[PDB]
Amino acid sequence: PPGPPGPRGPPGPPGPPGGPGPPGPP
Amino acid sequence: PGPPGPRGPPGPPGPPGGPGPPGPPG
Amino acid sequence: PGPPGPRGPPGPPGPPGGPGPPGPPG
């Protein structure tokens, strides 16, 4: 029969950097 | 011996990215 | 029984990071 199911793949790579912060105070 | 087992599932989503750059001057 | 299946593929890229730090004062 078929062998045991394989291991789960690796976690994906880190997401991209976030957007820019809000503008500073007036 | 039988054929190789079914392939494992895909990994989970990666970790979130880092924070974005500093915002613009007020 | 056959050999265990191959490891799954890498997961999706992680989510985008958070917002950056607030910008400097006007």
Residue numbers in the entry:
A (entry chain A): 1 to 26
B (entry chain B), C (entry chain C): 2 to 27
Could you pull the original sentences from the published paper?
Collagen's structure involves the assembly of three polyproline II helices, with each individual chain consisting of a three residue repeat sequence with the general form (Glycine–Xaa–Yaa). Within collagen's trademark triple-helical structure, three polyproline II helices are stitched together by a network of interstrand hydrogen bonding along the central axis of the right-handed triple helix. The triple helix is stabilized by the backbone NH groups of the Gly residues acting as hydrogen bond donors to the carbonyl oxygen of Xaa position residues in neighboring chains. To gain atomic level insight into these new rules we present two high-resolution crystal structures of collagen triple helices, with the first peptoid-containing collagen peptide structure.
